[PDB]
């Protein structure tokens, strides 16, 4: 009956995908692969600084752990191709290590015996990049490796698609005021990728930086390829982020009410709408991929010439996870 | 000899203006008025969380306190018009309470006996609004009440003026990623002005909010009145902010290097220039009113149509204070 | 059929008590009094930075608001004696303003027409001070004004009671590493009670300070009156605290296992026990008044002479609140 | 004829030792070894989140960098014994990597050609452990490898020595409320040494943990070996810490005044004394190894039996660094 999921990399996304898959029927996590030990993994599953105590029960058993009476096998294998995916009958691997963000590298899971692989990051090579409820329709079923884009990309796609479809997108720039991630440093130190800004103390600074969304958007919405670009400001909150988008449009007498109303009409399970004066902590744990915030809509008009600004909240952890799981369910049924 | 300054409201700006006036000759702080007691005031002058230990010496004496052997009189008077400004021979009152941000209300200092009043915030009524080195030239000497604009306005004016003068500003939107201020709440609580967002825990949230700069900019640069607008994102750093500006320009083939070079050429004591990949804490205590950050310049080109984004750092405390003291000095010598 | 509660002061404790009263049958909040407006109050009930979104539904109606279809009346009355408690049939007032922490002052609610008043803080005068499951048994029913002690006092009582009962408490000192509260400043500023330390930036400092538990403990456990004292270190977390207690005991060969086992055996609904290496954010929202942490037990032995150190976690918000509502329920049924 | 210093590991301590050595004559940093690249190194020297902009001038030149016109050679060598210490005429290596905290491992610097090695951490094997102005006197000059103890050990030694010498120390327990360090995680993640608590988000939790001071104290003050023990609470401030010590003494009628006066009398360049109601940020960048805080002295008396509590501030970064450089200067001159 149920789809067999294996998670590669029990990091923030992996553990959160695990939690979310608990609320979805027809999906079981049967395997978890990470290089850390099980005591540490069970402990980090049980307790989460921003996302709260894990509601079920977690105990380390022989071949891995038992979560709510169910067995999850665990491995400590740094080379994906070795993994017992064949033996275990994996339907889809949720690839969250960061170390396989390439169609050809991610192929190792298929050799090891898995049917499909969903990469929880933008990925290079000949594959589809999917934001659920924006372009998942482009999955036919034959694909064996799929990127699930990025957290910011998921916050951006539904907003740009409305803007483009209803008003015609000429060009836009974007800033995500974005929570700090574990790839940033606790104290000023050398950084892994030589990034002089990720090098700095994460929780004490506004840190300018790049975004996946910037380049990976034209992959989700081909008709606006090359028309958006932008970056991030990493700031001292541990999760919860906000995308601001400033654009020029074809349509001529755009009003604040027009924009909001267009977004309200496009809302669904993936794309929320709010008129409440909320703040970042109010979206910690939410399962919308993107929450349009109508209170932040601005329109600058100077003669016939307009600049339109909008903003959308997202839990860069849970919102992205929720979107990823949705893509996973859909992918598993083709 | 030296210009006699009285500070009204020994808050963040007041105390920091006091510190700064120590480094400037021809200006003495002779009076300080605030409704708290002297022990508390001397303590808060001596010790500063973000700005460091006060370098001199501070002790509570009879009529107030002694700072580096100099006597500062202190008062506890909630009605400004009562104050002994006449008796003390105040040349200028630095007005920092928040409660006199109006030409007519601030007139109370002139009645009480002071020559001029500089308001450390945007103010209402018939008065000039001054950003030093952008439009201080518009002071002729007869003015008796002057607004010193806002911190964000000071971060913005030199940037917009270069943009307008060299490229022609059609329109622009702005976001300041801005440190939290004492008008925000420690924990989620009722707020004094009914602001549902400033109501929230300051150091635990990205908090969308409004900016003084938005409206008060056309007062500093009349030729761009009504052409900019924007807001803030209050974030968990205690001081240090960054203004991002996204604009449309008249000039047609604008490059990143064009913009940066324009800004570098306009740099002075008020307006800095940097190419160093810095972060917010890197500007804590800086005395530029605005620091242009050439690493953040971005230009989006789609056919003949460009969007230009620039960003300038500022210490919303010290940067603004340094600008304010400059305006003070200049005003005193007319 | 249900007990009628009116909450005075819709601060952190008031709103959280309101939330908690939702899960408890036989208690209805029918009135809420606070000096702010209803839009603000409904908003702050709906959204909580640390404690999450309010699960039900909240909307502003005519005489106050509707929570999950139930009507709550709201008032804006600064003199408690005026309040329509008589007219409303209030059984108990949960007094959470801070401004009535005295038997004689709190009497104003009884005049206004309420049966009993439970003060959510230590209070002065001739009244009982109660920590549920430590000494609630001392309520006979005739009392009309009761103190619910403090958050820290609630974290400490069950621990000290076990220590005293099983080993004999000679003397002890205590430190609570304690989350910052809304009585502390956002930025270095004058403070309302002249506290030079509460004056300081709350989220940027380890701030030494006093505790309610210090003096209010002998009121809960008379037999150890004058035997404990201690303070607080306010630190940059928004909720979640930890009490460390260092003691000298009568019993002679105390082991770590002895202490832990004694605590484990005394555990109940109010007083939890754990051996998991948790951290503060792990107790956000917990309903134990005190959670003993057996991983932190330490025994120092030099010859026949021992120093025993123990530690107990508490959500100084929700832990205290759950305790307070328990006392409330019990008081209402006498 | 100035002393030639080489720094191994340009981390927080290394960079701060470099800064400090600028203010000390007779000491030159001529070499710096770290595995990161020079651009990163120059950048992190120039800019410091907590300790401010580097006051001189730093530019990347050929064999390393130029600081205030002076040449500093830089290497990228993971095996210390290879390093050109002989060729460069190093007098002392300041060893700050963390990876050579053992007399036998640190011997590699002597092989590579340095005269002496001072390890900026507690170290194992046959060597002296020094806290300047507490026991530096025990250096005779023949030693070639020395440990400089730990930051907390330095905050503790002068206080314990006074307590022991004046009142006679029976036993004590200790907690340092301690700034988070770079060895803690930004977000909940696996930890390098399997530490379930260092694993957690550093800036969002009170995190119980261990301390170097606990065991390394009897090495500095042999007469109190085995008489103290204690731990840490890592809390969300980036630097600035506080040691609380709870002790039992021989002397019988100890008063608060007695203790404070004893500490006041023992104060020097390494050991400060204050009666100001300060907080953590007030000690960032201070050069005392330890600052006794007479406002936190408590004495619990029940009959003839007392518990005495004291507390001392220290910038676990700069205070420790200042102590380390003093030990360095002294070691160099034997
Ligand atoms: C979200 O997937 C990640 O934390 C941040 O990168 P973006 O490029 O901001 O998505
Ligand atoms: C500085 O003026 C103060 O923070 C207010 O901020 P604005 O962004 O200038 O309104
Ligand atoms: C909890 O009631 C409140 O924060 C007071 O803390 P204490 O340290 O218990 O006074
Ligand atoms: C100080 O050297 C470093 O932060 C380690 O702290 P301890 O508590 O002294 O181990
Ligand atoms: Cl403000
Ligand atoms: Cl309080
Ligand atoms: Cl460490």
Tab-separated table of N, CA, C and O in Angstrom, chain A residues 133-165:
chain	number	residue	atom	x	y	z
A	133	UNK	N	2.472	22.939	-6.894
A	133	UNK	CA	1.388	23.870	-7.183
A	133	UNK	C	1.793	25.075	-7.999
A	133	UNK	O	1.008	25.996	-8.145
A	134	UNK	N	3.006	25.084	-8.533
A	134	UNK	CA	3.394	26.104	-9.498
A	134	UNK	C	3.724	25.436	-10.826
A	134	UNK	O	3.299	25.917	-11.873
A	135	UNK	N	4.465	24.330	-10.787
A	135	UNK	CA	4.764	23.595	-12.014
A	135	UNK	C	4.934	22.081	-11.884
A	135	UNK	O	5.621	21.477	-12.713
A	136	UNK	N	4.329	21.465	-10.862
A	136	UNK	CA	4.478	20.034	-10.675
A	136	UNK	C	3.792	19.272	-11.831
A	136	UNK	O	4.156	18.120	-12.177
A	137	UNK	N	2.842	19.961	-12.458
A	137	UNK	CA	2.116	19.456	-13.603
A	137	UNK	C	3.059	19.026	-14.714
A	137	UNK	O	2.681	18.249	-15.565
A	138	UNK	N	4.288	19.522	-14.700
A	138	UNK	CA	5.265	19.195	-15.735
A	138	UNK	C	5.942	17.836	-15.514
A	138	UNK	O	6.738	17.378	-16.346
A	139	UNK	N	5.631	17.191	-14.391
A	139	UNK	CA	6.088	15.829	-14.170
A	139	UNK	C	5.195	14.822	-14.916
A	139	UNK	O	3.978	14.766	-14.702
A	140	UNK	N	5.804	14.040	-15.802
A	140	UNK	CA	5.048	13.018	-16.523
A	140	UNK	C	5.131	11.648	-15.851
A	140	UNK	O	4.269	10.809	-16.073
A	141	UNK	N	6.157	11.424	-15.031
A	141	UNK	CA	6.340	10.131	-14.374
A	141	UNK	C	7.611	9.367	-14.721
A	141	UNK	O	8.110	8.590	-13.891
A	142	UNK	N	8.132	9.573	-15.934
A	142	UNK	CA	9.367	8.911	-16.366
A	142	UNK	C	10.638	9.372	-15.621
A	142	UNK	O	11.614	8.617	-15.580
A	143	UNK	N	10.624	10.584	-15.045
A	143	UNK	CA	11.809	11.167	-14.381
A	143	UNK	C	12.264	10.325	-13.195
A	143	UNK	O	11.452	9.782	-12.437
A	144	UNK	N	13.578	10.234	-13.050
A	144	UNK	CA	14.173	9.422	-12.022
A	144	UNK	C	14.940	10.295	-11.053
A	144	UNK	O	15.253	9.869	-9.958
A	145	UNK	N	15.259	11.515	-11.469
A	145	UNK	CA	15.942	12.490	-10.609
A	145	UNK	C	15.258	13.854	-10.760
A	145	UNK	O	15.062	14.365	-11.855
A	146	UNK	N	14.868	14.444	-9.654
A	146	UNK	CA	14.141	15.690	-9.708
A	146	UNK	C	14.672	16.590	-8.610
A	146	UNK	O	14.952	16.113	-7.505
A	147	UNK	N	14.852	17.873	-8.918
A	147	UNK	CA	15.182	18.863	-7.894
A	147	UNK	C	13.905	19.459	-7.375
A	147	UNK	O	12.981	19.740	-8.153
A	148	UNK	N	13.862	19.678	-6.063
A	148	UNK	CA	12.712	20.332	-5.435
A	148	UNK	C	12.912	21.811	-5.185
A	148	UNK	O	12.223	22.407	-4.346
A	149	UNK	N	13.845	22.389	-5.937
A	149	UNK	CA	14.219	23.806	-5.866
A	149	UNK	C	14.750	24.190	-4.493
A	149	UNK	O	15.393	23.395	-3.837
A	150	UNK	N	14.514	25.418	-4.065
A	150	UNK	CA	15.018	25.882	-2.774
A	150	UNK	C	13.869	26.497	-2.008
A	150	UNK	O	12.771	26.766	-2.586
A	151	UNK	N	14.123	26.737	-0.723
A	151	UNK	CA	13.115	27.360	0.109
A	151	UNK	C	12.666	28.710	-0.460
A	151	UNK	O	11.464	28.955	-0.618
A	152	UNK	N	13.614	29.564	-0.813
A	152	UNK	CA	13.242	30.857	-1.335
A	152	UNK	C	12.513	30.741	-2.679
A	152	UNK	O	11.524	31.457	-2.944
A	153	UNK	N	12.984	29.818	-3.511
A	153	UNK	CA	12.355	29.628	-4.803
A	153	UNK	C	10.885	29.288	-4.590
A	153	UNK	O	10.017	29.850	-5.264
A	154	UNK	N	10.615	28.412	-3.624
A	154	UNK	CA	9.241	28.079	-3.292
A	154	UNK	C	8.427	29.232	-2.759
A	154	UNK	O	7.205	29.252	-2.958
A	155	UNK	N	9.073	30.198	-2.101
A	155	UNK	CA	8.325	31.377	-1.612
A	155	UNK	C	8.025	32.332	-2.748
A	155	UNK	O	7.064	33.098	-2.671
A	156	UNK	N	8.838	32.258	-3.804
A	156	UNK	CA	8.799	33.235	-4.885
A	156	UNK	C	7.886	32.847	-6.067
A	156	UNK	O	7.172	33.703	-6.651
A	157	UNK	N	7.908	31.561	-6.420
A	157	UNK	CA	7.264	31.099	-7.622
A	157	UNK	C	5.800	31.498	-7.680
A	157	UNK	O	5.391	32.099	-8.659
A	158	UNK	N	5.007	31.218	-6.628
A	158	UNK	CA	3.570	31.494	-6.769
A	158	UNK	C	3.224	32.970	-6.926
A	158	UNK	O	2.207	33.311	-7.540
A	159	UNK	N	4.077	33.822	-6.366
A	159	UNK	CA	3.916	35.274	-6.400
A	159	UNK	C	4.278	35.820	-7.789
A	159	UNK	O	3.537	36.625	-8.364
A	160	UNK	N	5.411	35.370	-8.325
A	160	UNK	CA	5.835	35.778	-9.678
A	160	UNK	C	4.878	35.275	-10.767
A	160	UNK	O	4.567	35.993	-11.734
A	161	UNK	N	4.404	34.043	-10.602
A	161	UNK	CA	3.473	33.502	-11.569
A	161	UNK	C	2.159	34.316	-11.649
A	161	UNK	O	1.656	34.538	-12.744
A	162	UNK	N	1.629	34.755	-10.502
A	162	UNK	CA	0.446	35.606	-10.509
A	162	UNK	C	0.825	36.895	-11.197
A	162	UNK	O	0.191	37.270	-12.186
A	163	UNK	N	1.887	37.539	-10.716
A	163	UNK	CA	2.315	38.818	-11.269
A	163	UNK	C	2.473	38.750	-12.773
A	163	UNK	O	1.972	39.611	-13.497
A	164	UNK	N	3.130	37.703	-13.248
A	164	UNK	CA	3.333	37.553	-14.690
A	164	UNK	C	2.070	37.290	-15.464
A	164	UNK	O	1.754	38.084	-16.323
A	165	UNK	N	1.350	36.218	-15.140
A	165	UNK	CA	0.021	35.931	-15.707
A	165	UNK	C	-1.025	37.061	-15.702
A	165	UNK	O	-1.736	37.220	-16.684
